[PDB]
Amino acid sequence: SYTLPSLPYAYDALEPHFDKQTMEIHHTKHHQTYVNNANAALESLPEFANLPVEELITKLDQLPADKKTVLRNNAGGHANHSLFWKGLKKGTTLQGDLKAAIERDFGSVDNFKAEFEKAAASRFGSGWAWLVLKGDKLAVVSTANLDSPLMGEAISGASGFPIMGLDVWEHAYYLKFQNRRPDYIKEFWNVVNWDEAAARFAAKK
Amino acid sequence: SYTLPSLPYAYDALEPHFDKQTMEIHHTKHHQTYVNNANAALESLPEFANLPVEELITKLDQLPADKKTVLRNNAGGHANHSLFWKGLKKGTTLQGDLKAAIERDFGSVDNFKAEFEKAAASRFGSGWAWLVLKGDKLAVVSTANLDSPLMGEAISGASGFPIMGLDVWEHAYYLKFQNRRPDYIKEFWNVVNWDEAAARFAAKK
Numbered sequence: 001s002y003t004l005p006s007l008p009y010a011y012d013a014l015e016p017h018f019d020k021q022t023m024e025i026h027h028t029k030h031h032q033t034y035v036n037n038a039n040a041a042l043e044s045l046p047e048f049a050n051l052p053v054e055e056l057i058t059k060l061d062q063l064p065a066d067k068k069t070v071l072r073n074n075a076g077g078h079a080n081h082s083l084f085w086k087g088l089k090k091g092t093t094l095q096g097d098l099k100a101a102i103e104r105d106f107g108s109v110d111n112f113k114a115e116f117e118k119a120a121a122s123r124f125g126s127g128w129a130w131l132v133l134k135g136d137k138l139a140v141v142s143t144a145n146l147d148s149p150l151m152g153e154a155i156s157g158a159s160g161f162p163i164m165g166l167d168v169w170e171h172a173y174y175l176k177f178q179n180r181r182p183d184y185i186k187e188f189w190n191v192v193n194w195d196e197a198a199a200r201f202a203a204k205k
Numbered sequence: 206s207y208t209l210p211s212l213p214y215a216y217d218a219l220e221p222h223f224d225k226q227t228m229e230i231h232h233t234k235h236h237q238t239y240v241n242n243a244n245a246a247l248e249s250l251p252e253f254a255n256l257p258v259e260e261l262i263t264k265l266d267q268l269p270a271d272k273k274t275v276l277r278n279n280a281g282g283h284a285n286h287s288l289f290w291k292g293l294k295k296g297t298t299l300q301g302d303l304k305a306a307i308e309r310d311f312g313s314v315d316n317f318k319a320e321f322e323k324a325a326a327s328r329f330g331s332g333w334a335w336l337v338l339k340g341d342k343l344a345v346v347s348t349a350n351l352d353s354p355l356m357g358e359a360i361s362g363a364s365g366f367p368i369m370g371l372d373v374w375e376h377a378y379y380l381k382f383q384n385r386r387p388d389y390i391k392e393f394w395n396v397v398n399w400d401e402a403a404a405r406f407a408a409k410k
């Protein structure tokens with residue numbers, strides 16, 4: 001069974017960029033719900049019930065036709081949010097190999113940020129924006145609802161290993177920024193955990 | 206060109222059910238954006254710019270490939286929100302032929318409400334829930350993002366003439382209800398404008 005992961009910091013640890021109220025609701029209400037719904041669906045699927053969530057979402061095609069959608073959405077939600085919490089932290093700095101790769105594939109850090117912001121702002125409806133690693137090159141992509149690049153191109157319309165991502169569902173920014181998603185996107189740069197991003201880039205898997 | 210319609214009531218006319226702050230943001234920020242984007246796209250299409258928005262969204266397939274998505278989303282947004290504002294009003298009562306038709310196709314008003322709430326609550330991600338008239342029978346359907354049943358089944362996955370609808374994008378309820386969409390759905394029953402719904406049912410088109 002899946003469980004809500006504990007946060008590696010306090011709910012007000014990302015202030016003054018991401019508000020404490022949202023962090024608490026986002027974690028204890030939204031993420032908790034995905035976990036609860038995924039577990040309920042897996043109760044009748046012993047063969048899949050015990051796989052790590054990141055593995056389950058790479059095998060959605062093997063699931064019974066009547067369970068595929070519920071798990072795609074909720075296991076996807078669990079995987080994405082779990083990655084999100086670990087990918088946030090104040091006071092980090094982009095450096096080393098990751099920075100070099102960024103400048104290499106995007107020309108410069110500023111060009112990268114511009115491309116990421118464009119993808120995050122253009123995602124219509126609910127979705128996520130990602131920095132992925134596809135065949136040794138970094139790229140920016142976005143997915144709908146709670147899909148993940150790990151699900152494959154056929155399902156999510158994207159592929160690649162997620163280095164970092166930004167949740168652009170309205171619940172992630174409405175209390176503090178309301179309709180101003182672009183302002184939320186800019187604040188994100190102050191809390192993106194570059195250390196974790198670097199670690200994932202090094203691992204590659 | 207489309208004009209942003211003014212609301213048929215003050216921003217606080219739906220209190221204490223729907224909050225004044227959201228009504229103002231929803232109308233002056235979100236709806237305004239859909240109108241702006243739709244007009245920008247229609248600039249080079251004089252032939253389509255003259256049609257009423259409700260008519261334009263039934264002919265999305267006749268638009269040039271590069272204008273189809275932008276207009277589907279934004280013209281859809283304009284059509285849906287325009288209908289939404291007119292469909293809200295306190296103090297109305299479900300009666301007459303509309304009530305009879307509801308009880309006829311759903312067995313009872315309570316059964317209808319249950320079906321509508323289920324559709325509104327189960328829509329994952331951004332979307333709308335609708336009470337539509339297909340031929341001579343009433344039915345409950347839901348669409349993704351800013352699609353409308355008027356767009357046809359091929360595009361939206363649903364069809365029928367909209368009698369009334371509920372916006373379930375998180376911006377419609379997050380400030381007051383946060384994650385509690387079910388509470389928002391319940392409050393809706395207090396502000397659904399049954400007089401307008403009856404009028405649309407009578408016109409049948």
Ligand SMILES: [Mn+2]
Nearest residue numbers: 030167169172
């Ligand atoms: Mn989220």
Ligand SMILES: [Mn+2]
Nearest residue numbers: 235372374377
């Ligand atoms: Mn809306």
